[PDB]
Amino acid sequence: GSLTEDGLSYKEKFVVRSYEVGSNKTATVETIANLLQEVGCNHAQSVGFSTTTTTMRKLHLIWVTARMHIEIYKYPAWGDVVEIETWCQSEGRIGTRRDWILKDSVTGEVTGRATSKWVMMNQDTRRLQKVSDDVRDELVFCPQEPRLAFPEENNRSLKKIPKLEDPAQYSMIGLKPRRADLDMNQHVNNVTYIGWVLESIPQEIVDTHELQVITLDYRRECQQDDVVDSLTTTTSDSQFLHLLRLSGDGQEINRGTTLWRKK
Amino acid sequence: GSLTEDGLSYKEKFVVRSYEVGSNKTATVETIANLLQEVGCNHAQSVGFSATTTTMRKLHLIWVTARMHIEIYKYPAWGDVVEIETWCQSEGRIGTRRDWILKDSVTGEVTGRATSKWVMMNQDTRRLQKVSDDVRDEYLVFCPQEPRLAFPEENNRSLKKIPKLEDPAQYSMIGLKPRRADLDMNQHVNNVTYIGWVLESIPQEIVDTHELQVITLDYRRECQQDDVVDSLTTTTSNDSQFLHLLRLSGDGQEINRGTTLWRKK
Numbered sequence: 001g002s003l004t005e006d007g008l009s010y011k012e013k014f015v016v017r018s019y020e021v022g023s024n025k026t027a028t029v030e031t032i033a034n035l036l037q038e039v040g041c042n043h044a045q046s047v048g049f050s051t052t053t054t055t056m057r058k059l060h061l062i063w064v065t066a067r068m069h070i071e072i073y074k075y076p077a078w079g080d081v082v083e084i085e086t087w088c089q090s091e092g093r094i095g096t097r098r099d100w101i102l103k104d105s106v107t108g109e110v111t112g113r114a115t116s117k118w119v120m121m122n123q124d125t126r127r128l129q130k131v132s133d134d135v136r137d138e139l140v141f142c143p144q145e146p147r148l149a150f151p152e153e154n155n156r157s158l159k160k161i162p163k164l165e166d167p168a169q170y171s172m173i174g175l176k177p178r179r180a181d182l183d184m185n186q187h188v189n190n191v192t193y194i195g196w197v198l199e200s201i202p203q204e205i206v207d208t209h210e211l212q213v214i215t216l217d218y219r220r221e222c223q224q225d226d227v228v229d230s231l232t233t234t235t236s237d238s239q240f241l242h243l244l245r246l247s248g249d250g251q252e253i254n255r256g257t258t259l260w261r262k263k
Numbered sequence: 264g265s266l267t268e269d270g271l272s273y274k275e276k277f278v279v280r281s282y283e284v285g286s287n288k289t290a291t292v293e294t295i296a297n298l299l300q301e302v303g304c305n306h307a308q309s310v311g312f313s314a315t316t317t318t319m320r321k322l323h324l325i326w327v328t329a330r331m332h333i334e335i336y337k338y339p340a341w342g343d344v345v346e347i348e349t350w351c352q353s354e355g356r357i358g359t360r361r362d363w364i365l366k367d368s369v370t371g372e373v374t375g376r377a378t379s380k381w382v383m384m385n386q387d388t389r390r391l392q393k394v395s396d397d398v399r400d401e402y403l404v405f406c407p408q409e410p411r412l413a414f415p416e417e418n419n420r421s422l423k424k425i426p427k428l429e430d431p432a433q434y435s436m437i438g439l440k441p442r443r444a445d446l447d448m449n450q451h452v453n454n455v456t457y458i459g460w461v462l463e464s465i466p467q468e469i470v471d472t473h474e475l476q477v478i479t480l481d482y483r484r485e486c487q488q489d490d491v492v493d494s495l496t497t498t499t500s501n502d503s504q505f506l507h508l509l510r511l512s513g514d515g516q517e518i519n520r521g522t523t524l525w526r527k528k
């Protein structure tokens with residue numbers, strides 16, 4: 001792991017582990033999602049961010065994920081080395097965007113790519129806001145010219161996701177996180193929501209198709225003592241509309257869409 | 264990762280990752296348990312395996328874990344490098360034993376150690392086998408001939424008979440079911456998931472004020488993907504001892520039993 005020559009991006013190689021692969025002996029989307037998070041963590045540390053900026057800690061501000069979009073063309077097989085390059089950019093006074101490019105260490109070809117949108121919120125009141133011009137200025141770790149992993153106009157990462165109507169075609173109910181699903185701050189790791197979204201996809205779909213695209217909008221955090229219901233409906237290759245909600249009151253926590261290709 | 268000079272053990276360094284640590288910014292026992300299994304997988308591949316031999320694949324035989332014992336003195340912090348050395352040994356016709364030693368890459372001190380016992384089993388009928396002599400000679404070339412135990416001591420805690428938890432349990436965590444992330448490359452529930460499910464019944468206040476020092480876990484039956492588990496716990500004691508029991512939510516079929524030991528921070 002190291003910052004590139006210009007100091008405006010970070011690269012890291014990862015050997016895929018035995019427990020990180022699925023039945024087809026290639027890394028799972030949750031392993032990829034974990035690797036994207038790990039490289040983003042290391043990039044923040046290499047530029048001087050402790051375990052948020054100085055102004056962000058003085059107030060009580062945090063960066064929260066609003067959207068995650070991942071497109072995979074080839075999943076790295078068990079034992080393969082995958083190189084991930086990440087970088088951040090200011091999306092005006094709306095928030096911050098982080099992008100990734102996944103490559104094969106041997107061929108050098110792009111085998112996947114991701115993008116995420118982050119908003120500012122108060123740690124405690126959990127409100128939102130985003131104005132902070134001093135927070136914007138402390139921009140020195142970002143490319144000044146736009147560098148998008150998803151440049152194409154009319155691309156899959158900027159589409160409005162509708163809400164799943166009842167009854168859902170498929171469902172997986174009674175989903176609750178364990179201590180392994182929690183992070184270093186005791187919050188549910190936002191990779192767990194991806195795993196919970198795909199819990200409602202039927203096993204036959206997973207056995208005969210490979211996940212090509214996943215777009216996930218984060219609406220609310222799931223507490224440790226909360227229970228989630230995962231809902232799915234085919235909207236068509238194979239397209240699915242998803243919805244995570246609290247088992248009780250039916251409070252929306254996530255909504256998304258996946259796209260699968262025949263193997 | 265590489266075999267040591269004699270080819271009778273394997274070593275591997277691991278940098279601890281952000282998502283691998285708990286509330287005290289040190290790796291979790293499930294991260295350690297995953298790293299032990301990853302180094303054991305690489306050791307088997309580096310000597311020519313896929314840990315089935317020629318006679319095992321021929322007769323549909325598999326190595327299944329019967330017991331896991333892990334003792335940690337210091338959990339590697341996020342960003343630290345941990346070196347793990349592993350090796351196998353024949354335990355007669357009962358099965359094989361695999362041991363690990365965890366070390367700090369910077370100081371070189373032993374920060375943890377583990378041992379596991381494996382039995383031979385027909386993949387299909389589930390019936391256990393007494394390790395035959397053809398199979399014994401196939402892997403004996405990859406093992407030290409003289410005993411090399413991570414837990415040598417004349418009265419070690421890795422050879423104790425674990426009793427069954429009596430009802431009512433002091434603590435419990437009910438309705439535990441695995442997701443696809445809890446499954447392995449063969450669609451079976453990862454042995455590491457049972458460790459996480461055992462500790463689900465330990466109270467949060469115990470976890471917040473104590474460090475897990477020892478864990479001994481006996482595997483009695485595998486939990487299918489479509490099964491639901493109940494995790495039960497009872498204090499059996501500056502230190503804290505617990506007796507554990509995992510069972511199927513329905514019929515109450517035993518799948519696991521264990522004991523953990525915690526020390527005050």
Ligand SMILES: Cn1ccc(C(=O)NC[C@@H]2CCCO2)n1
Pocket residue numbers: 064065066067119126218219220221222
């Ligand atoms: C408990 N809680 C409240 C809000 C959140 C959260 O993570 N929301 C994601 C944000 C709000 C809209 C944009 O993304 N969690």
Ligand SMILES: Cn1ccc(C(=O)NC[C@@H]2CCCO2)n1
Pocket residue numbers: 327328329330382389482483484485
């Ligand atoms: C269905 N089934 C039978 C055995 C298992 C298993 O995974 N382990 C248990 C055996 C008994 C000795 C220790 O391994 N699963």
